[PDB]
Structures are given as C-alpha cells and as structure tokens.
C-alpha cells in the first residue's frame, strides 16, 4: 500500500481510506485496466523511447 513496492503502482501511489491504494499516472498516460499499470493515451507520451532503431529485432 505505497508502503511496499509503491503499492503495485507503475507510477504514482496515494493512500486512500481503509488502507486502500489509489494509483495514478503522469500526463499522456491512463490507468491501465488492472488499476495499477499506466498505458499511453497519446501517440508520443513523455519519457519513452519509441524509435527502437527502426527494426532490428523480433518486434
């Protein structure tokens, strides 16, 4: 619950009533289905490498 492992929040964690965890994400992101992970809500969200040198792997 934020206490341990950021309370299972990929980005931010906050403590709600009844020791409940409420996750949140930064601009350009949205709370993934599980209510923990953060997923892109825009074509080019801050902080991520999308180039990946064209294509030189499994992809």
């Amino acid at each position: 619950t934020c206490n341990i492992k950021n309370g299972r929040c990929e980005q931010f964690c906050k403590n709600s009533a009844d020791n409940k965890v409420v996750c949140s994400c930064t601009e350009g992101y949205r709370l993934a289905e599980n209510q923990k992970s953060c997923e892109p809500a825009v074509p080019f969200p801050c902080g991520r490498v999308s180039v990946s040198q064209t294509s030189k792997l499994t992809r």
Partner: protein
C-alpha cells in the same frame, strides 16, 4: 560528457541542443511542444538563441532535426540572487513555433515534488549532451550519454570548497573518469522508471571534469517542479 558512450538515434528524444553566439553551447529537455527546460547560466545574456530537437550528430543531417527560435527566456527568479553561486540554476525557453512530436522529438516526464525526489533517490540516472568528452576538447559530434550514481550529501560537501545547497545534488563515481562537462549544461539528469524516464536534474556545474574525488553538481529538479508546470502551461 566524459567517459560515456554514443547514444543511438532516438535514444533520448527529449534532448535538445542550443545554438547561438557559440554553437552547441548547452543542452536542454523538452517539457512540451512549446517549452524547453535548461540551465540559467547558459542563457543570462538573453541574446538570440536557437533550439534543435531531434538532433544526434551535430555535423550531419539526419532529417529528424527540428529547429526553432527562442522568443522568451525565463530564468528562475532567484538565480544569481547571490552572485556566482549557481543556486537556482534552471531556466525555461519558449519556442516561436511548436515542435511536432514524433519518435525523435518526445517530451521528458516531470513528476510532482515528492515523486521526483523519490526517483532521484533511486540513486541512478543518465546524463547526456554534446559537451566535452576530453580535456580541453571541443563539442562531441555525436550525442553522448552516461549513467551516474547518486552521491551521499556528506561526501558531496567534503569534495568541494564551494557551497552545495539543498537545491543541488552530487552525482559521479568515487574514482572519477565519468562526468558531464562543459557544454553539457542545461542537459537532463534523467531517472528511468520502468521504461519511462523522468527529469530529476539539470546538468549545472563542477570543478574541471571527471577528476577523482570531484563530482558533477546538478540542479535538484524536485524543488522547481511546481515552477516548471506553472510557467509552461499550454493555452
């Protein structure tokens, strides 16, 4: 950057270079389409300056470069309140025309005060720039990057005669040999959080570069997080 490595095209899409009276004189980071965050000591003279995003090799053409003119410079209101101290070494730059975000032009994430400071305390971040790679050397043609460990505050104080304020933090290795350097100012100290990078510092100053027993000093972004968001709002 001294002792670092060549970045790969698009590895640090938020990194920009600043050109003016001197070419590649400092670095910066994209806050958003219209704003760049850098170091105040890089833009005191308010002279004409240019910004190049999507830059990789400063003497070649990648066709990913986006140049823009700076029409407004906002250094931190307390920078130089006490002459020559480098405290509050942070500045914001507004662009004439908005950048078009793509794979080589992406903003850097900026968390709140509490989390920015939490990410910094992870103790490991990357610094990048086209600054010097060697003693008395010129700009690096290819963007360089280096991973630098955070330094306990007490060790920081004992490493320099100059005052290290709570608006700054030390980073570097005990042995030296790896450091950000002249020309890298304004550049970002970023902390990688599960595939997502956050701005935790602004390359600011030091004593020479890479010297053993010395450390790079960075502006502590967490302290200016509210100031950044308030000034760079899109309308």
């Amino acid at each position: 950057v001294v002792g670092g490595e060549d970045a790969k095209p698009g590895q640090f899409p938020w990194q920009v270079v600043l050109n003016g009276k001197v070419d590649a004189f400092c670095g910066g980071s994209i806050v958003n389409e219209k704003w760049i965050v850098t170091a105040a000591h890089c833009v005191e003279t308010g002279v004409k300056i240019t910004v190049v995003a999507g830059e990789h090799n400063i003497e070649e053409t990648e066709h990913t470069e986006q140049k823009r003119n700076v029409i407004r410079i906002i250094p931190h209101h307390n920078f130089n309140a006490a002459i020559n101290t480098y405290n509050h070494d942070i500045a914001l730059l507004e662009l004439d025309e908005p950048l078009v975000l793509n794979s080589y032009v992406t903003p850097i994430c900026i968390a709140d005060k509490e989390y920015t400071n939490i990410f910094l305390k992870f103790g490991s971040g990357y610094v990048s720039g086209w600054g010097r790679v060697f003693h008395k050397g010129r700009a690096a043609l290819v963007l360089q990057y280096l991973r630098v460990p955070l330094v306990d505050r007490a060790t920081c104080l004992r490493s320099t005669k100059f005052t290290i304020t709570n608006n700054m933090f030390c980073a570097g290795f005990h042995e030296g040999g790896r450091d950000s350097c002249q020309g890298d100012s304004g550049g970002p100290h970023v902390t990688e959080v599960e595939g997502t990078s956050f701005l935790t510092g602004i390359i600011s100053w030091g004593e020479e570069c890479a010297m053993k027993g010395k450390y790079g000093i960075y502006t502590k972004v967490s302290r200016y997080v509210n100031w950044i968001k308030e000034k760079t709002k899109l309308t």
